[PDB]
Amino acid sequence: AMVLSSAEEDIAESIRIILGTARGERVMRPDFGCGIHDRVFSVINTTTLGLIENEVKEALILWEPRIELLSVTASPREAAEGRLLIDIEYRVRSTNTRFNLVYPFYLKESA
Numbered sequence: 001a002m003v004l005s006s007a008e009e010d011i012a013e014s015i016r017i018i019l020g021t022a023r024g025e026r027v028m029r030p031d032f033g034c035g036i037h038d039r040v041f042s043v044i045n046t047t048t049l050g051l052i053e054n055e056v057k058e059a060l061i062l063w064e065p066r067i068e069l070l071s072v073t074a075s076p077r078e079a080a081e082g083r084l085l086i087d088i089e090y091r092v093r094s095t096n097t098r099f100n101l102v103y104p105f106y107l108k109e110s111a
Contacts, residue, residue, distance in 0.1 A: 008092060011066050012101055015088065018063045019056060019103050034059035040110050044084075049074040056086055056103070067092055082107045 022037035024030045036055045041048060052074045060069055071089040078085055086103040 007066065007094060008097070008099065011064065011092060012099070014064050014066075015060060015090075015101055016103065018059050019086070032063065036105065044107075049076070049084075052084065052105075053086070056088070060088075060090075066094065070098065078104075079107075 018032075019034050019036070021033035023033040023035065026032050034055060035058070036052060039055075044052075053072045056074075057069055057072050060067065060072075067090040069088070069090050071087065073087045075085045075087055084105045084107060086105065088101045088103060089098065090101070091098050
């Protein structure tokens, strides 16, 4: 059973693919992904949240040219449940329409 989706939905999926892929995960395209997966954090301070934000920005700018990023914010609002949520506001360039996407990262033990 197939649905026909438009670019808007493909873009949202693409965003999720990019953020959920570590560089090196794709054997044939080892540069593809988001640098957040390379990081180990001893502490996550307020400035670290900005670092996480900007890793997301850079990955989306590089791998999802169909959007202009408007806001990227790493919220600790679900930190008690071991998640860091990335609130991403963006403009689809082909339609000038704005969308929001919340991307969850899960805080886990390093090893």
